[PDB]
Amino acid sequence: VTEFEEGVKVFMATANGTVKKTVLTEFNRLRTAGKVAIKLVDGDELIGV
């Protein structure tokens, strides 16, 4: 990400064909330990953002 601006969204696609959309401004500032962004189930992993 070059910079955070406007109200663009983030598209997340995992295995088994599950999609999810979230606003970028949520990830504007993060601490040393990050926050939960997706509730994965069983053996599922993010493949594309």
Added chain:
DNA sequence: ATAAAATCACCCGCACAGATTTTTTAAAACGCGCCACGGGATTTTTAAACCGGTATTTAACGGTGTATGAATCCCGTTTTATCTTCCTTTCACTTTCTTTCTCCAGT
């Protein structure tokens, strides 16, 4: 008794780096609820396989001239095995305090 050589505590102001100590904030959680979404049972439509044929497009092959992979030699990096140590602990000993038992001079 004359010579050679050493060591430490505190007071007064001021500026700053580092170590606790509250205080605020964002993430995680719980309870309740409702409607968005996916399952199941019909209609509908279209993606790809199949017959042709033609017209290109690729890969295998035969010469030259390099760039690099394995081997060797080192030196900083991190692990692991290996020493010494100060507080916890009791404990037999020693010391020190408290009560008691006589002596004993005086009348």
